[PDB]
Design a protein around this nucleic acid. Sequence first.
RNA 1: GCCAGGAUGUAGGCUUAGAAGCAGCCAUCAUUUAAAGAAAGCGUAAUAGCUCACUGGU
Length: 74
Amino acid sequence: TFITKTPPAAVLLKKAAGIESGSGEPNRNKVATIKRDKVREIAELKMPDLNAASIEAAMRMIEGTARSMGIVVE
RNA sequence: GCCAGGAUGUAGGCUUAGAAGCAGCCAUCAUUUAAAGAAAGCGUAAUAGCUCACUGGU
Ligand SMILES: [K+]
Ligand SMILES: [Mg+2]
Ligand SMILES: [Mg+2]
Ligand SMILES: [Mg+2]
Ligand SMILES: [Mg+2]
Ligand SMILES: [Mg+2]
Ligand SMILES: [Mg+2]
Ligand SMILES: [Mg+2]
Ligand SMILES: [Mg+2]
Ligand SMILES: [Mg+2]
Ligand SMILES: [Mg+2]
Ligand SMILES: [Os+3]
Ligand SMILES: [Os+3]
């Protein structure tokens, strides 16, 4: 009955990586490198607000947002 | 030609008083798809709104 909207993937990724802001040049200057176990946790929490058909698809999106801000997943 | 869609993470990150597809900078991934650009124009203070690409019907 009441919408609990979760934080933007970006702010979730910022928190996970432990930083205050993304790269001004995503491709050239990476400012953080997290592991998938985390990208996975984000895709699980952000799941209600996602239109994915599975977690791996959810992570695809989450990782896509990590690419736009300069964060690296391993 | 006309009708209908043109979506979701997301107001991408940065910067900026604001900067939400559309001041400027760096990128331009992914999801759900029949299709739909991190958007080709108009538009807003920033939003909104309208149109285009793209798809279906006729
Ligand atoms: K803008
Ligand atoms: Mg003609
Ligand atoms: Mg979008
Ligand atoms: Mg912003
Ligand atoms: Mg904001
Ligand atoms: Mg400055
Ligand atoms: Mg809008
Ligand atoms: Mg922008
Ligand atoms: Mg639009
Ligand atoms: Mg503008
Ligand atoms: Mg039309
Ligand atoms: Os319309
Ligand atoms: Os596509």
